[PDB]
């Protein structure tokens, strides 16, 4: 349960919640899964390493600027044209 995680710092829990909202379920539980290995030891180690990267990435405020994925590029152009269609209430 991310919100009530004493071990994680309160500013970090907020940043993790927005960044990894897609992982948090209806109950507010951050869910991490790994299936990259046959052995449960390696799978569990992958999940724990994921938790560590989340806390580290959260505390590193200057997120590195990087080239967007090709999927993001068109979505940016689509979002830009969608705003172009927005109009203003003529009489308000």
């Amino acid at each position: 349960h991310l919100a009530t995680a004493e071990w994680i710092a309160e500013p970090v829990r907020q940043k993790i919640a927005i960044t990894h909202k897609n992982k948090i379920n209806r109950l507010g539980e951050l869910i991490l899964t790994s299936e990259s290995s046959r052995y449960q030891f390696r799978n569990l180690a992958d999940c724990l390493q994921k938790i560590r990267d989340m806390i580290t990435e959260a505390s590193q405020t200057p997120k590195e600027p990087t080239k967007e994925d090709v999927k993001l590029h068109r979505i940016r152009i689509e979002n830009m044209n969608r705003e172009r269609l927005r109009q203003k209430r003529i009489h308000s």
């Binding site: 897609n22 948090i24 379920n25 209806r26 869910i31």
Partner: protein, 102 residues
């Protein structure tokens, strides 16, 4: 002293992506839908599906000087035709599967 060139996959045959449909010294069969061309004019499937041979109107690229000269000298009303080979995609690109119930 002979070699084997020609249609590897006949009409209605099932091909996988990368299958060589035909090999030719010169363009005898032209690439249609989902059919790639190699450096040696080899025709290969770009998708999985059924091979089809059709007769389509031929329009060369505007910068293909040799071919553009031919069509410009044709009598008006005359259309060039060529044999094209196509692959009809048999399967969809993918499906949407339920993966989580958050």
């Amino acid at each position: 002293s002979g070699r084997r060139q020609g249609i590897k996959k006949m009409e209605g045959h099932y091909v996988h992506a990368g299958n060589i449909i035909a090999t030719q010294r010169h363009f005898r069969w032209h690439p249609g839908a989902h059919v790639g061309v190699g450096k040696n004019k080899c025709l290969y499937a770009l998708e999985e599906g059924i091979v089809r041979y059709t007769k389509e109107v031929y329009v060369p690229h505007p910068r293909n000087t040799e071919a553009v000269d031919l069509i410009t000298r044709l009598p008006k009303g005359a259309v060039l035709y060529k044999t094209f080979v196509h692959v009809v995609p048999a399967k969809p690109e993918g499906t949407f599967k339920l993966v989580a119930m958050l």
